[PDB]
Every structure is written in C-alpha cells, then in structure tokens.
Amino acid sequence: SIAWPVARTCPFSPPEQYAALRAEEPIARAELWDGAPVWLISRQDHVRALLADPRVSIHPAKLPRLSPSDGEAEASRSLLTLDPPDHGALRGHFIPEFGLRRVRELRPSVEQIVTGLLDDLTARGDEADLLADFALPMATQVICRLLDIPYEDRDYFQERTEQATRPAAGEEALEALLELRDYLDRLISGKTGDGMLGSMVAQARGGGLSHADVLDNAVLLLAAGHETTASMVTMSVLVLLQHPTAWRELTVNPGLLPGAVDELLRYLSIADGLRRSATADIEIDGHTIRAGDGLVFLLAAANRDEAVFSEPEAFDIHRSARRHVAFGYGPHQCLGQNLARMELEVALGAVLERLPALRPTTDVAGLRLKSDSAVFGVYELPVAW
Numbered sequence: 001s002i003a004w005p006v007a008r009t010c011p012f013s014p015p016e017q018y019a020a021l022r023a024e025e026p027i028a029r030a031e032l033w034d035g036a037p038v039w040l041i042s043r044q045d046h047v048r049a050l051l052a053d054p055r056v057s058i059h060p061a062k063l064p065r066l067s068p069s070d071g072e073a074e075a076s077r078s079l080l081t082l083d084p085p086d087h088g089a090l091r092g093h094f095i096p097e098f099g100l101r102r103v104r105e106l107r108p109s110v111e112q113i114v115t116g117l118l119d120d121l122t123a124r125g126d127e128a129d130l131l132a133d134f135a136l137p138m139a140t141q142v143i144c145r146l147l148d149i150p151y152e153d154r155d156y157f158q159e160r161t162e163q164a165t166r167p168a169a170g171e172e173a174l175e176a177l178l179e180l181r182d183y184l185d186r187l188i189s190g191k192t193g194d195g196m197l198g199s200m201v202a203q204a205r206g207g208g209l210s211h212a213d214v215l216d217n218a219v220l221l222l223a224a225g226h227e228t229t230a231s232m233v234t235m236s237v238l239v240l241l242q243h244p245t246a247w248r249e250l251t252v253n254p255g256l257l258p259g260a261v262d263e264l265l266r267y268l269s270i271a272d273g274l275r276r277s278a279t280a281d282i283e284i285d286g287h288t289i290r291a292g293d294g295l296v297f298l299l300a301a302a303n304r305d306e307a308v309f310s311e312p313e314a315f316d317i318h319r320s321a322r323r324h325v326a327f328g329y330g331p332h333q334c335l336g337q338n339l340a341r342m343e344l345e346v347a348l349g350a351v352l353e354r355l356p357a358l359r360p361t362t363d364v365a366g367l368r369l370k371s372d373s374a375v376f377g378v379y380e381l382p383v384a385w
C-alpha cells in the first residue's frame with residue numbers, strides 16, 4: 001500500500017507518515033518500485049533488536065533494490081556488503097584509526113582546519129554558502145588527511161560521491177560510481193606509504209588484505225568520510241539558526257556542546273532507511289517476516305520514538321540523555337562515529353565563536369533538499385554574519 005522510498009521533503013522533520021507507522025503499524029508491509037515486498041521498521045526497540053539479530057543480512061545478493069539498475073557495480077568487500085564473520089575480521093583492521101585514542105589525537109588538526117577556513121571566510125566577505133565554503137571543505141580536508149588522498153582532487157571525487165550515493169538514480173549515478181571506484185584504484189596503483197590508505201596498501205602486500213578489501217573500503221571511507229560530515233555540519237547550523245535560545249546558551253556554555261551534538265544527530269537523522277534482508281523467518285510483534293523479505297530501518301522514525309524521547313518532535317538541547325540510532329545499530333554501527341562527533345563539536349563551537357551574528361539569507365521553504373540521496377541534506381546554505 002505504502003510505496004518505498006517515501007520522499008523526505010522537510011529539512012527538520014521526517015515524512016509525516018513515519019509517526020503513524022510507529023503508532024499504528026510498527027512492522028509495516030510495503031512495496032518497492034517493482035512490487036517486491038519490504039518491511040518498514042519504525043520503533044527504536046524493533047530497529048535495534050532486528051539490526052543486531054543474526055537472521056538479518058546486509059549481503060548484496062538479497063538486498064532490497066530501489067530500481068532496475070540498483071545493484072550494478074556493487075562492491076564485494078565493502079564493510080557495507082559483508083555479514084559476519086568476514087565483516088568483523090575486516091573491520092578489525094580499521095578500528096585503530098577510529099577509536100577515542102586516535103580521534104582525540106586528530107582534534108588539533110580539525111581545529112586548525114576549521115580556524116583557517118573561518119579566517120579566509122571572514123577576511124573575504126560577510127556572506128557565503130556554508131556548505132560549499134565551509135562544511136564541505138572542512139569535512140573533505142579531514143578525510144583527505146586521515147586517508148592521505150590529494151585534497152587537490154576534491155572537485156573530481158566530491159561531485160562523483162554525491163551522484164553515486166543516490167541509490168534509485170539512473171546512469172549518471174552509475175557512471176559516477178564507476179568513475180569514483182577508478183579514481184581510488186588509480187590512487188592505490190600509485191602507492192605501489194602514509195595515511196590510512198598507505199597503511200591499507202601495505203597490509204595488502206603482506207598477506208593481510210585483498211585488493212578488493214582495499215579498494216572497496218577506500219571508496220566507502222572517502223565517500224562516507226566527507227559527505228555525511230559536510231551535510232551534518234550544514235544541517236546542524238541550519239537547525240541552530242532556527243533556535244536563538246540554544247544559539248546563545250551554547251555560546252555562553254560550550255560544556256553543552258557534546259549534548260547538543262547528540263541531540264542534533266537524533267533530530268536531523270540524515271541517515272535513514274537502511275536496507276537488509278531476512279535469511280530466516282522472524283516473528284516480531286504479531287507478524288512473521290519471511291526468509292528473503294526485505295527490511296527497511298527508519299532510523300529517522302526511531303529517533304522520534306515517543307516511547308523513548310519525550311516531545312520527540314522538539315529540538316531540545318536540555319533533554320535527558322537517551323541513546324539514539326543516528327549511527328545505526330548492530331555490527332555495522334558507524335565506524336566513524338567518534339570522528340563525526342568530534343568534527344561536529346569543533347565546527348559548531350568555532351561557528352558560534354567566529355560568526356556570532358550568523359543569519360540565513362534565504363527562506364527555509366526555498367532550500368533545495370537532497371531527498372533521493374542516501375545522505376540527506378541541502379544543495380546549498382546561504383548565510384550572512
């Protein structure tokens with residue numbers, strides 16, 4: 001009855017049906033472009049239980065698909081295409097680059113990047129596109145430093161990333177992904193030292209990783225690395241511009257910032273609709289999911305679950321702290337989440353200090369939304385300060 005995907009058409013609020021599903025239909029039967037059956041999971045308790053359940057698979061051969069061409073140029077050793085046990089064996093090689101230890105080590109870089117950017121920006125003028133002139137370059141520079149990827153090629157890989165991450169899109173999306181993967185393959189053939197990509201190249205020379213372990217995850221890290229953080233920064237600024245109380249309170253007490261970052265993550269929920277399939281029959285809440293059925297995890301719905309968050313539709317930096325699923329749940333829970341939280345704290349703290357009188361210069365209804373992207377966001381954010 002319900003089509004999937006449902007377009008996200010409001011920056012600050014997921015689709016209205018999500019509320020009805022959580023209340024009235026928490027394991028909801030829906031249909032893909034070609035009528036294949038999918039289940040929509042909207043409550044936090046069911047999202048977490050199912051995403052952690054060994055009968056739920058991310059394996060690309062049975063994954064629900066959003067068009068006739070979705071599935072073309074699919075990777076084979078990406079973290080996002082591997083089930084246990086392979087998944088953790090591989091993820092184990094990358095975890096040292098993403099722990100608290102390492103993330104705190106990186107924070108001074110991020111602060112310097114952020115400060116240089118805002119120096120230029122304020123010197124040059126009092127207007128800008130916050131995504132193109134600040135969020136995207138911060139996020140790209142950070143991931144370029146971590147991986148050791150030429151920041152100079154940004155034009156190339158940024159436009160491709162953006163096109164490639166539209167899962168229902170036609171040949172433009174597919175050509176972008178093919179070209180994106182050839183870009184990383186060119187960079188890898190060039191090492192054959194520094195950064196995570198140097199380290200991965202080394203481990204593939206020792207017996208340790210395959211070429212596809214290396215390629216597939218370079219693409220994943222580079223794309224997820226910059227697209228998510230750019231969007232989250234942008235969108236987090238947009239939200240704070242609608243909340244002058246919160247803007248002032250965070251400027252005066254930066255100790256509020258770690259908490260506000262979780263509340264922005266929950267509220268915005270830029271990652272939504274994660275896809276899985278069931279490899280066995282699954283009984284949950286009076287329904288039976290059949291082996292082979294598709295599963296869709298409405299993280300944005302679950303992050304507004306009235307059973308978990310009071311006044312869940314309110315953005316509230318003073319709410320009691322509750323765990324959210326903006327980063328997903330189970331074995332594929334965002335590997336970059338410590339880095340992402342640190343980037344956001346740094347970026348937002350700096351914006352508050354350096355641009356205290358920031359204003360938007362276009363209406364909210366006039367922003368262009370990335371509704372068919374896997375990473376929700378806007379195409380630009382015009383501001384003045």
Ligand code: HEM
Nearest residue numbers: 079080224225228229232271274327328332334335336340
């Ligand atoms: C800033 C906001 C970010 C959000 C909201 C976000 C959200 C997510 C979500 C929801 C997943 C799970 C996808 C699935 O289970 O199907 C995920 C996985 C991932 N994230 Fe992020 N992420 C962010 C930032 C980053 C950054 C900065 C990096 C890397 C530098 C990154 C690297 C990854 C990787 C490698 C995975 C796959 C992990 C696995 O399958 O084991 N993320 N992220």
Ligand SMILES: CC[C@H]1OC(=O)C[C@@H](O)[C@H](C)[C@@H](O[C@@H]2O[C@H](C)[C@@H](O)[C@H](N(C)C)[C@H]2O)[C@@H](CC=O)C[C@@H](C)C(=O)/C=C/C(C)=C/[C@@H]1C
Nearest residue numbers: 070071072073074164165166167173174220223224271374
């Ligand atoms: C919800 C945040 C999560 O987002 C995804 O994991 C999106 C991830 O599913 C793409 C959408 C997906 O793109 C789709 O890949 C298909 C095989 C293609 O057939 C399809 N066609 C249209 C080009 C392409 O769009 C990725 C390939 C599968 O992993 C794209 C590459 C660049 C990639 O690995 C991107 C990963 C990102 C952005 C992960 C963040 C954390």
